Every structure is written in C-alpha cells, then in structure tokens.
C-alpha cells in the first residue's frame, strides 16, 4: 500500500507485523519526499542515504466483525461466516533527509 504520511499521524495496517507494541522501526521504501518549496522523486525508489522515516507501534488489535453471507434463491443455499482481521496501528515519528543530492 502507498501512504501519504507526515509527522505525528496514525495509519492502520490490516496485518500483524510480529513486533512488540511500542517498538520503533524504519520504512526503507520511500517513493516521494516533498516540502513547501522542493520535491524529490525516486526512480522508482530513493536511496537509503537520502531519506529516512521511522514509525512506532502503538496498537495491535483485531478488526470489528465482518459479515460474509451467500444466498441463492429457491436452492436452499444460505451460508454465513464472521471474520476479524488482525490490524496494527503505527505512528510516524519523524521524517529525516540528508544533503546527498550530489
């Protein structure tokens, strides 16, 4: 998934990352970094030494119940299933860049 993130925001990943809550990680796949006056683009990804972004796990919970119902008329076909998808919430802490354009 592609996310337009900034500092101090929450995004929801519909999966478990096998990480303890409160741990801070780094996201190495950055496609675009922009500012008020300048913007830098990757082809298709920026170098690791150019931009660094880090996030902290703050929540690991299940999803609300979801209904999966299938019905066919006049065939006695009726099935119901309830699923909950594990999800994780990450808070983007800081976005850092370095003057490595040259």
């Amino acid at each position: 998934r592609q996310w337009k993130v900034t500092s101090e925001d929450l995004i929801l990943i519909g999966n478990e990352l096998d990480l303890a809550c409160g741990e801070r990680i780094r996201l190495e796949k950055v496609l675009l970094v922009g500012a008020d006056n300048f913007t830098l683009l990757g082809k298709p990804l920026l170098g690791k030494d150019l931009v660094r972004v880090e996030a902290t796990v703050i929540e690991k919970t299940e999803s609300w119940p979801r209904i999966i119902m299938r019905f066919r008329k006049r065939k006695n076909f009726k099935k119901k299933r309830i699923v909950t998808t594990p999800q994780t919430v990450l808070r983007i802490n800081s976005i850092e860049i370095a003057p490595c354009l040259l």
């Binding site: 496609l31 082809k43 999966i68 119902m69």
Partner: protein
C-alpha cells in the same frame, strides 16, 4: 420425556436486533424481518467489491479534474509518469492534487516534458540521442 424449546426468545432476538433500524413492520415481525436481514447481509458482503471499484473511479475523476486545470489529459499524465519510473497509484495522485497543489503541478510538468521528449524521439529516425528524462535506470 417431553422436550420443548425454552430459548426461542433469544433465538429470534439475535435476528431482530439487526433489523432494529428498518422501516415498517419488517423491523419487529420475525417472519418479515428474517427475509430482509438476509438480503441486507448479502448486499453488505458484495458491496466490498463495489467499494474498491467506486473509490478508484472517484480518484480518476479527481486526477482528471486537476490535470485539466494544468492543460493535461488523464491518459497523458498516467502513462508519462510510468515512463518516468514514478510508480504512484491513483490514491496518492489524488491526495497530492487535493493537498499538495505545487507538488502536483511539478508532476504535471514532468509528464508534459516527458510527452514532448517522446514526440521528438518519434520525430527523429533514431540517430539522435535519447532524451534527458527518457533515460531508464536498469536494475540487476
């Protein structure tokens, strides 16, 4: 041994609770409510496919609106960015247009510059060198 059902009140309450916000007698009569609750459940399950389709269509409309403001067409902007190795999907492109007008304008400039580069390359017979922004980064 005579056995009679003693929890039928709870067996019908688990269905009536899903129809509490309906209109007419079908929100309280179990015979009517069970038939419409099933339809509501079926519609909800298949609406997830429609949500993914409709959201993409909304993004395409917004991207087209922003591009037309810059004198560009949606097919021209989408294809040229791909040729520039800029893999941005429809959502972020719509997000950039709404919230980052200056960044989106730069992307529109990049597409138009790439579009003119391809026209010049097609205009030539191949003897001319490649365009500045037409170079592709090779990965091994």
């Amino acid at each position: 041994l005579r056995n009679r059902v003693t929890d039928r009140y709870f067996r019908i309450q688990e269905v009536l609770k899903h129809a509490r916000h309906f209109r007419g007698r079908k929100n309280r009569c179990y015979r009517l409510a069970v038939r419409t609750v099933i339809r509501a459940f079926v519609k909800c399950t298949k609406a997830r496919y429609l949500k993914k389709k409709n959201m993409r269509t909304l993004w395409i409309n917004r991207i087209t609106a922003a591009s037309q403001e810059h004198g560009l067409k949606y097919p021209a902007l989408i294809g040229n960015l791909v040729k520039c190795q800029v893999e941005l999907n429809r959502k972020v492109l719509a997000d950039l247009a709404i919230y980052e007008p200056k960044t989106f304008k730069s992307l529109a400039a990049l597409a138009s510059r790439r579009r003119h580069e391809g026209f010049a390359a097609a205009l030539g017979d191949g003897k001319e060198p490649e365009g500045i922004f037409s170079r592709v980064v090779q990965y091994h």
